[PDB]
């Protein structure tokens, strides 16, 4: 973000590797939970547009999500420009040229320009504005794809049961829960959360069906 | 069902009080288990439509289930009639008027007519047909509502939270579950299953909210 020299200039300080590592951990662990959004906001405090793009490049491997963010950003940038039409006239010595949508997204603007806008009196808060666009994007992402908590791990209508089992157990293993809670998860929730067609098959098995028997029973359902 | 006189007539014999008592015991004990359906079928062997209605009157106190059976029966009866349109012409001396949907459900038909249909050569098996409709109904009932369980204990949109807590804990105490599963029930499911307005309040409490604090927080929600 932004820090002041002993010589009085507002200069840029890159986001700490520890803040960055935390953000990447949040995304890794909190898949697409509503919980990501508040964390993103906390971690991106004070960020310039350059910093925000730095955070996003760190979780860019999520290509379908990055695509969703791109479209949101392009949309909001386009509306910004509609509300803030380009003005060709000269800039008075005590004015500052307003940012365009692409300046806010960091695409057509420099760090120096971002800092000049952010620390103006009053600010042109391009870090906060870009952050709002990203948050709009993140909300659209979570709303389109649901969280992944144990309880919300549900077999898809066409998901091979072996794949569902894997997801289920992976999610299970990463949780911090007591063994009695985990025992309920394996013995009842797994069937509880199977799709309609597999559940019906699973529920018609015997008293002591083994997981391997379950997989055999639901193969190609 | 149906039995033959020494004089050769097929006459009606009421269902034995012991068969009836067994069926009522099955329903009492096997709440809404898939197990009810095979039992119902075994116990209703040979039943005329009158007999089937006799069995249902015996477990009629289950009003939400009886309502579900009514709707299924009305639906199937309506399709029967579509497949079996009324024919106004005279009936030949060696023919028998076909049953309507309501005749099969026993509503517009007499025991004598039911027996006449059932023992025709070949039969018009109105007992078996009505039994299939009832079974369609029972399957819909089990599939819709689980047998008494903690997971489907949900606070009503206008239910005082103290009443929900009572129901929840009563259900909890009667279960045979491990302590770690019950700990998850009290610490997370109770909030999980609160209504939309109470959950939002509960989720905005601190790290260590006591149940008494929860009740205070959700009072009149």
UniProtKB/Swiss-Prot annotation, chains A, B:
Which of the residues bear the PTM Phosphoserine? 16
Q: Where in the cell is it found?
A: Virion
Annotated region (Dimerization/Multimerization of capsid protein p24) at 145-221
Q: Which residues of the full protein are shown?
A: 133 to 353 of 1435
**PTM characteristics:** Phosphorylated possibly by host MAPK1; this phosphorylation is necessary for Pin1-mediated virion uncoating.
- Assembly and binders: Homodimer; the homodimer further multimerizes as homohexamers or homopentamers. Interacts with human PPIA/CYPA; This interaction stabilizes the capsid. Interacts with human NUP153. Interacts with host PDZD8; this interaction stabilizes the capsid. Interacts with monkey TRIM5; this interaction destabilizes the capsid.
Q: What is this protein called?
A: Capsid protein p24
Q: Where is this site: Cis/trans isomerization of proline peptide bond?
A: 89-90
What is the recorded function of this protein according to its Swiss-Prot or TrEMBL entry?
Forms the conical core that encapsulates the genomic RNA-nucleocapsid complex in the virion. Most core are conical, with only 7% tubular. The core is constituted by capsid protein hexamer subunits. The core is disassembled soon after virion entry. Host restriction factors such as TRIM5-alpha or TRIMCyp bind retroviral capsids and cause premature capsid disassembly, leading to blocks in reverse transcription. Capsid restriction by TRIM5 is one of the factors which restricts HIV-1 to the human species. Host PIN1 apparently facilitates the virion uncoating.
Residue segments, region Interaction with human PPIA/CYPA and NUP153: 57-95
